[PDB]
Amino acid sequence: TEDDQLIAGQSARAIMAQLPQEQKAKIAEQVASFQEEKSKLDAEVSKWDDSGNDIIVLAKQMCMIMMEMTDFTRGKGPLKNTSDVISAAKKIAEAGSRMDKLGRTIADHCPDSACKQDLLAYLQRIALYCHQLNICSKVKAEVQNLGGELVVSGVDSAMSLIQAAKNLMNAVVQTVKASYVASTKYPAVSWKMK
Amino acid sequence: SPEFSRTSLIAGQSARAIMAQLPQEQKAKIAEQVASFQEEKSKLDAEVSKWDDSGNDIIVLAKQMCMIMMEMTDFTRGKGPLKNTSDVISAAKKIAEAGSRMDKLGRTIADHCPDSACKQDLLAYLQRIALYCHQLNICSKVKAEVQNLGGELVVSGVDSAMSLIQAAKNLMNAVVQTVKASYVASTKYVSWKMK
Ligand SMILES: [Br-]
Ligand SMILES: [Br-]
Ligand SMILES: [Br-]
Ligand SMILES: [Br-]
Ligand SMILES: [Br-]
């Protein structure tokens, strides 16, 4: 069942590690773009103490699984086969579903309409990009006929996966910010500065 | 480009699908090997045509091995029922178990043969059955390879395919020689009924 999922006879991560430099460089540019969004999330969560704030806890744990996926597109990290990437997406979607519950509780107890709506829209983005990560995690690198050779291309699947993670990262940042704001207009979530 | 299909369900390109689109330079070397395999398989067709399969489990087993072996050579061309590497491996396993059963029956025929030369000839061919079954098992596990060349990661299935086919060709030749020799060693005193 491991050899069910090989591409051209090798593990998915091994294929990413052997992609031609041009593909690897296009992937690296997306990864660097991803690290900018991770920078915004690190700066936001570092404002808050994670005791009694599972939103912050879940944000950090979603971010750390996305880094495993980001590493996978470079042929590194713990995710070896497609099934591992799928399962990592699944964990992220679970954490997002838990973040969405907490966030909706905060929203319902908020009577500031514009703050309510902003929070709820960011929680839709969490759902959207958790789904997108699930979808993108099932797209394997592909084999293409080019000039009488069979060549491996994984750049498109890697970049779509990274792009979904970038967007999810941004949705988490907005959700953290908007959850704190909505709370100050009211709690299972304590917003203690660090 | 190789056909996408549902794999274990998400889209993927299976080993059989990859064989099916190998560059025609790779496919030409494989066809050459399959042609010489076909020659050996003819010789089995002629030999087992000459006999009735009732009570002759030697001949029953020989057509069983031939049919699975054709599934394997078809795989190297992107055809037949073996889709995944694990299918090629399990096909080699069932060939090996058939060969085990053929070896068993063969060795009892040999041990009841009073012509010493004919006994030894039969036993020699049975040794080839056992060696070539093991060797087909080995070759069934060889995967395609990828190599960074030309600024591309390029796929090649030539070497696993040719190795699989040469293994099946050796075993095919051993099986037909084993039938011819099982009968000869039977003449010297499993039913060898024609038609
Ligand atoms: Br390169
Ligand atoms: Br490219
Ligand atoms: Br609340
Ligand atoms: Br297929
Ligand atoms: Br054939």
B3: chain A residues, CB-CB within 8 Å: none
Q: Which residues of A touch B (CB under 8 A)?
A: 1, 3-10, 15, 18-22, 82, 138-140, 142-146, 148-152
Rounded CA gap, A83 and A95, in Å?
18
Element (H, E) at B144: none
Can you tell me which residue has the tokens 């055809």?
Answer: B79
Q: How far is CA B78 from CA B75, B82, B98, in A?
A: 5, 9, 25
Count CB neighbours of B144 within 10 A: 23
How many whole angstroms from B170 Cα to the centroid of ligand 5? Answer: 14
Can you tell me which residue has the tokens 């889709």?
Answer: B83
CATH number at residue B158: 1.20.120.230
Task: Give the best residue of A143, A146, A155, A160 to mutate against chain B (max B CB count within 10 A).
Answer: A143
Return the half-sphere exposure (C-beta side, CA atoms, 13 A cut-off) of residue B170.
Answer: 18
Q: How far is CA B135 from CA B27, B140, B161, B191, in A?
A: 23, 9, 14, 30
Q: What are the residue ranges of helices labelled H in A46-154?
A: 54-73, 82-108, 113-136
Return contacts of A2-6, CB within 8 angstroms, 24+ apart. A2/A81, A3/B84, A3/B85, A3/B86, A4/B7, A4/B8, A4/B84, A4/B86, A5/A81, A5/A82, A5/A83, A5/A140, A5/B7, A5/B8, A5/B12, A6/A81, A6/B85, A6/B143
Note the Cα A7 to chain centre separation in Å: 24
How many whole angstroms from A55 Cα to the centroid of ligand 3? Answer: 12
Helix (H, G, I), strand (E, B) or coil at A76: coil
Going A6 to A10 to A12 to A15, the CA torsion angle's sign is negative
One-letter amino acid identity for B40?
E
B85: chain A residues, CB-CB within 8 Å: 3, 6, 9
Resolution of this PDB entry, in A?
Answer: 2.2
A18: chain B residues, CB-CB within 8 Å: 146, 148, 153
Q: Which domain holds residue B105?
A: 1-195
Q: What's the Rg (C-alpha) of chain B?
A: 19
Q: Which residue, among A144, A165, A141, has the nearest Cα to A5 in the 3D structure?
A: A141
Q: Method of determination?
A: X-ray
How many whole angstroms from B11 Cα to the centroid of ligand 1? Answer: 27
Q: How many domains does chain B have?
A: 1
Rounded CA gap, A156 and A192, in Å?
42
Contacts of A168 (CB under 8 A, 6+ apart): A62, A66, A92, A96, A125, A126, A129, A130, A132, A133
Return the half-sphere exposure (C-beta side, CA atoms, 13 A cut-off) of residue B70.
Answer: 12
| Cross-sheet strand order for the sheet of B152-156 | A142-146, A149-153, B152-156, B145-149
Q: What's the Rg (C-alpha) of chain A?
A: 19
What letter would DSSP give residue B148? E
Q: Do B146 and A10 touch (CB under 8 A)?
A: yes
Q: What are the residue ranges of helices labelled H in chain B?
A: 15-20, 24-49, 57-76, 85-111, 116-140, 158-187
Chain discontinuities in chain B, listed by preceding residue (C to N exceeding 2.5 Å): 8, 189
